[PDB]
């Protein structure tokens with residue numbers, strides 16, 4: 001968990017979320033398996 005972890009998580013709140021949180025989530029956390037089939041009703 002570097003300084004960027006908090007930065008990333010904070011800037012996600014600017015509506016950035018996906019692509020920031022996730023990207024860095026990939027490197028920020030060890031648990032990255034919390035997805036769900038939201039809006040995947042034909043996919």
Ligand SMILES: *[C@@H]1O[C@H](CO)[C@@H](O)[C@H](O)[C@H]1NC(C)=O
Pocket residue numbers: 017018019020
């Ligand atoms: C993840 O982030 C990218 C940023 O361009 C966005 O296009 C995509 O829709 C996001 N995915 C979800 C499921 O939020």
Ligand SMILES: *[C@@H]1O[C@H](CO)[C@@H](O)[C@H](O)[C@H]1NC(C)=O
Pocket residue numbers: 038039040041042043
């Ligand atoms: C199908 O895949 C897309 C990939 O971006 C994802 O939004 C979701 O899992 C599904 N989308 C819908 C509208 O079914």
